[PDB]
Structure 1
Amino acid sequence: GRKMDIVIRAAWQLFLEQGFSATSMDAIAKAAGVSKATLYAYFPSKEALFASLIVAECESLQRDLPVPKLSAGLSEALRDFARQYLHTFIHRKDVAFVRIIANESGRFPVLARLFYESGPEATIRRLAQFLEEARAARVLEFDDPMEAANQFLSLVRGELPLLIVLGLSDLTEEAIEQEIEAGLKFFLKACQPRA
């Protein structure tokens, strides 16, 4: 319980610095100061270990996103959600996770999909349920809620992933507000019923 966490942190450190495949359960045990018997009692395999990291970190992220309320106002709800989406993008593991998994060159499709469904797709679904509410209230129009959620996020996140990866993204809070307001303005321009 108290030990399992020292293992997690040691493993994360190695996965970042070297990648998944280049990190052995052997190295992990030694970095965390445990016997292999111990290590394997907590985690039946390196794949299971990484899955723990993924589900845990991804569920954590998902708690720091709001559940958008239509009572808050349509715009402010979306604006809030975008804001938190981008803060999580910038300051959390999603980029690191993707580098790590992308480095595996498709050797681990189950882990890849687990991340996708636990994070990115989960974000889409939360927003989608909110959008379904907004459409039920006749305050937005669109054929598919997931599709519309994905469109919204795509606009808001724009080309920030690329910029970050290249090390060119530097986003003050005011810079972020601008990214959001542009994305939102456009999204509403396409889904607000013209009237």
Structure 2
Amino acid sequence: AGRKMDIVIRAAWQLFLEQGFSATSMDAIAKAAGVSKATLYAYFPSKEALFASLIVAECESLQRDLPVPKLSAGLSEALRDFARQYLHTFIHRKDVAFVRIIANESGRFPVLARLFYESGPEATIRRLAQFLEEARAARVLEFDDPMEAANQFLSLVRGELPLLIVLGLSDLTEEAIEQEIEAGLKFFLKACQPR
């Protein structure tokens, strides 16, 4: 239906962040959003389905803010743009929050854990890997597996940032981001360019 749905999502996100997923009840969500349990369960048949809707919405959205790298832009420039958008999504979006909420469930909801992984981090690997296939086909990178190589690129460029963010110590200027990206990219190319 209508406007109470998006009020329900926002009310639920707030409670999941402050209290965790299992600690938040559909009862509390209904109260916070000012709907009957009838209206709430008509939109989302369970708490699990609600969190699933939230994961898929945020991950589909983060995926749209990511360029599709074109080799016509230059190899270095393509990878530098992708890296830059990838780190911006980390800093300015809910990935770390999602992981904190699921990690706090101590393995109770594996189906939600996998849904987040496959909609987000694995989706980002697959998008980069498609582009790394194009670049290997153009004989300008060499590697055995594109998914393996996409994971390596993202690991290099990401470094320890997710831990710094979770500890409240990531406070890195745009200039500091370009340095992280340049170092990861330099190293990826040292390993994958024909030599």
TM-score norm. by structure 2 comes to 0.99
2: CA distance between counterparts of 1:28 and 1:175? Answer: 40
1:81 Cα deviation from its structure 2 partner:
0.2
**Aligned counterparts of 1:44 and 1:70: Cα–Cα separation in 2:** 45
**Residues of 1 paired with 2:45 and 2:82: CA distance?**
37
* Rounded Cα–Cα distance in structure 2 between residues aligned with 1:185 and 1:40: 52
Give 3-state SS (helix, strand or coil) of 1:44's partner: coil
Residue 169 of structure 1: how far off its partner (Å): 1.2
Other structure's SS at 1:40 match: helix
What do the CA deviations read for 1:32-69 (whole angstroms, capped 9, x no partner)?
Answer: 00000000000000000000000000000000011111
C-alpha deviation, 1:167, in angstroms? 1.3
Q: Secondary structure at the match of 1:67?
A: coil
SS of corresponding position for 2:136: helix
By how many angstroms is 1:92 displaced?
A: 0.4
Gaps of 5+ in 1: none
Deviation at 1:132, TM superposition (A): 0.4
Distance, in Å, in 2 between the alignment partners of 1:115 and 1:101 is: 9
Q: Give the Cα separation in 2 of the matches to 1:46 and 1:77.
A: 40
Deviation at 1:165, TM superposition (A): 1.2
Structure 2: how far apart are the matches of 1:47 and 1:119? 18
Percent identical across equivalent pairs? 100
Partner of 2:133: 132
Shift, 1:2, TM fit: 1.4
Distance in 1 (CA, whole Å) between partners of 2:12 and 2:20 is 10
Counterpart CA distance in 2 for 1:71 and 1:185 is 20
Aligned to 2:43: 42
TM-score after normalising by structure 1: 0.99
Uncovered stretches (5+) of structure 2, i.e. residues with no partner: none
Runs of 4 or more, structure 1, over 2 Å off, are: none
Deviates more, 1:158-167 or 1:123-132: 158-167
Structure 1 residue 166 displacement after superposition: 1.2
1:160 deviates by 0.7
Alpha-carbon distance between aligned partners in 1 of 2:168 and 2:50, rounded to the nearest angstrom: 30
